[PDB]
């Protein structure tokens, strides 16, 4: 798969492909690899869909508990900590990599990557999945600083489309989500919308 997230001044933009296969047969072409964890914290899953969904539900419950306990929207670092702990506790039997994007009033837009084995780390742009090995050169050639919303959209569009056309494990449609102070906006690219 292909999950790409990057922050910009005012929020974060995160997109993913929609291919889920069991063998060479495409099990489902309309998968949402982006599972909304909180109102302004979003997740991107890679690997075995069952493990990703299970850990997504578990972290959703834990973070809902934490938020209602603090009566204040959780920090992205906190969420990333739970993802790290859960992934490490089951890494011997977990096939699941998670990219956590979000916005909080404490700092702004935050993106934390947790690849296989549980690297809870932070960076500007994070690309994960089986398709992360095809646009690495392309994203390194196309990445700049100071994105706007429109530029973020185009970056996601072309990068994920190149991963789409070059990798056989990314297909279907493109799912995009932008988190900011205003809120979260979700869009789906299908057909002529993709480049």
């Amino acid at each position: 798969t292909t999950i790409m997230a990057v922050q910009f001044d005012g929020g974060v933009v995160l997109g993913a492909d929609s291919r889920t296969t069991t063998g060479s047969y495409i099990a489902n072409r309309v998968t949402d690899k982006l599972t909304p964890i909180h109102d302004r914290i979003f997740c991107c899953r890679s690997g075995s869909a069952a493990d990703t969904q299970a850990v997504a539900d578990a972290v959703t419950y834990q973070l809902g508990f934490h938020s209602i306990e603090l009566n204040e929207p959780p920090l992205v670092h906190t969420a990333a900590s739970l993802f790290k702990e859960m992934c490490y506790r089951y890494r011997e039997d977990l096939m699941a990599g998670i990219i956590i994007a979000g916005w909080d009033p404490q700092e702004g837009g935050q993106v934390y990557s947790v690849p296989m084995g549980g690297m809870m780390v932070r960076q500007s742009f994070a690309i994960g999945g089986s398709g992360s090995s095809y646009i690495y050169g392309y994203v390194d050639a196309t990445y700049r600083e100071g994105m706007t919303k429109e530029e973020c959209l185009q970056f996601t569009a072309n990068a994920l489309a190149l991963a789409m056309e070059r990798d056989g494990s990314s297909g279907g449609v493109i799912r995009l989500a932008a988190i900011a102070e205003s809120g979260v906006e979700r869009q789906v690219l299908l057909g002529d919308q993709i480049p």
Binding site: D57, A58, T60, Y61, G64, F65, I68, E69, N71
Partner: protein
């Protein structure tokens, strides 16, 4: 005729009475405050007396009503420590419910679950039965707003309106006098009726800064805690009218 039986919770008195439960109910009124909830066609308003010993006390932390979940609000009285332990337990129960069943807790279900917890608490001799009385409010589809009351005995009930505290009897009588008129109770009307009941049961004509209000409506499913501006507007509008 039954003297030693008012010692242990798990001990039945002659005539089948559990004196420890009744003592817990009396302990609810040890706080000395008063809460009351009123439900309209599509709104539910809870209002609680605020008692500030000193300006030294931080008014943001001395609240007597809390929020269990984003759409389910709780207002309660009794022992403050028991109150906070009970709200923590209720939040745990609601979150676990959502985790295991994938959708929000209805007010009645949360009340029933915590009532079962309290019943198990009062059935075994290992527990002091959490002497605090809670009222949950929230919106459920196909049934509108819901107000439910739970007591240390494990008895939960839905209410068109309810009250608790030292002045529970008189507040309930006033609420009965109000409900026998069978009026639709729009949101402002619900709030002003509850405020009038509290004022007449305290006979203090409180200042705006001594009360807390929470409201849940279908158009505002989030359990909103009324800030000073809204409560002041409501009470002055009532006062002029």
């Amino acid at each position: 005729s039954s003297a030693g039986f008012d010692r242990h919770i798990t001990i039945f008195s002659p005539e089948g009475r559990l004196y420890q439960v009744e003592y817990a109910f009396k302990a609810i009124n040890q706080g000395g405050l008063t809460s009351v909830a009123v439900r309209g066609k599509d709104c539910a308003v809870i209002v609680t007396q605020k008692k500030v010993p000193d300006k030294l006390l931080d008014s943001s932390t001395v609240t007597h009503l809390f929020k269990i979940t984003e759409n389910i609000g709780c207002v309660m009285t009794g022992m403050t420590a028991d109150s906070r332990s009970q709200v923590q337990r209720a939040r745990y129960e609601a979150a676990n419910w959502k985790y295991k069943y994938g959708y929000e807790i209805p007010v009645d279900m949360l009340c029933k679950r915590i009532a079962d917890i309290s019943q198990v608490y009062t059935q075994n001799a290992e527990m002091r039965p959490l002497g605090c009385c809670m009222i949950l409010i929230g919106i459920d589809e196909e049934q509108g707003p819901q107000v439910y009351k739970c007591d240390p005995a494990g008895y939960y009930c839905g209410f068109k309106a309810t009250a608790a505290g030292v002045k529970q009897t008189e507040s309930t009588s006033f609420l009965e006098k109000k409900v026998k008129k069978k009026f639709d109770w729009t949101f402002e009307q619900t709030v002003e009726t509850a405020i009038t009941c509290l004022s007449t049961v305290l006979s203090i004509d409180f200042k705006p800064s001594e009360i807390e209000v929470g409201v849940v409506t279908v158009e505002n499913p989030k359990f909103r805690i009324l800030t000073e501006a809204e409560i002041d507007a409501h009470l002055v509008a009532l006062a002029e009218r």
